[PDB]
């Protein structure tokens, strides 16, 4: 995308989302990041939406294939699961590479830095879902470390109802439950996040209230599933 203007890449990413062309969306946003400038709030959301949808489809396909493979236990199911797995790992590596070169290091405001560190935690989490053995350990720790740094900044710099802070806590709680084998930590984090947000809703406008309560309901939905 080196020959396309930054503004044209952003415009085409928005069109790609409307057309449900998420692979295109992700390619346009990768090209925009590679222009080297920082991303605005809206541009960060386009980047995240694009790759979350691409990797979300890969994850769903990997889970279908992994289920068939486990029931089976010729080489074809394993070979095809491996193919999908390699593709998924490649997309995660691409996103992590954008964050490392150089989105995180240039992000100084709490909103941007937390957003990118939450993404870093998420893409290491997706790598951990398909990892085995000792590789799993260092990948799991990388996710943990990114989420922890994001949590530390969010608790110092953002109110407890901030939607980025809430979504980070939601995703880190999923990490604890599904990856780290720490269901009690997951439940504790979701409960404390929910309760601290509840106590701060009185400060918010109608539109901010709607955003914060939407994510609080996601925390509650997980707590209902886990308890």
């Amino acid at each position: 995308m080196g020959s396309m203007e930054r503004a044209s890449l952003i415009q085409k990413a928005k069109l790609a989302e409307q057309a449900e062309r998420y692979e295109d969306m992700a390619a346009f946003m990768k090209g925009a990041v590679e222009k080297g400038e920082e991303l605005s709030c809206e541009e960060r959301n386009l980047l995240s939406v694009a790759y979350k949808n691409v990797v979300g489809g890969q994850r769903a396909a990997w889970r279908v294939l992994s289920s068939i493979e486990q029931k089976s236990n010729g080489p074809e199911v394993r070979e095809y699961r491996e193919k999908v797995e390699t593709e998924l790992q490649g997309v995660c590596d691409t996103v992590l590479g954008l964050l490392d070169s150089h989105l995180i290091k240039e992000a100084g405001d709490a909103e941007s830095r937390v957003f990118y560190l939450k993404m870093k935690g998420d893409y290491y989490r997706y790598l951990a879902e398909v990892a085995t053995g000792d590789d799993k350990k260092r990948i799991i720790d990388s996710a943990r470390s990114a989420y922890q740094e994001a949590m530390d900044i969010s608790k110092k710099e953002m109110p407890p109802t901030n939607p980025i802070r809430l979504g980070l806590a939601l995703n880190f709680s999923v990490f604890h439950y599904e990856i780290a084998n720490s269901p009690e930590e997951a439940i504790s984090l979701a409960k404390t996040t929910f309760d601290e947000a509840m106590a701060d809703l009185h400060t918010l406008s109608e539109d901010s209230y709607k955003d914060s309560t939407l994510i609080m309901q996601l925390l509650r939905d997980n707590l209902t599933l886990w308890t």
Binding site: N45, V174, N222
Partner: peptide, 9 residues
Amino acid sequence: AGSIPGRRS
């Protein structure tokens, strides 16, 4: 369980 969606919908 569920993680954050890409958009509010």
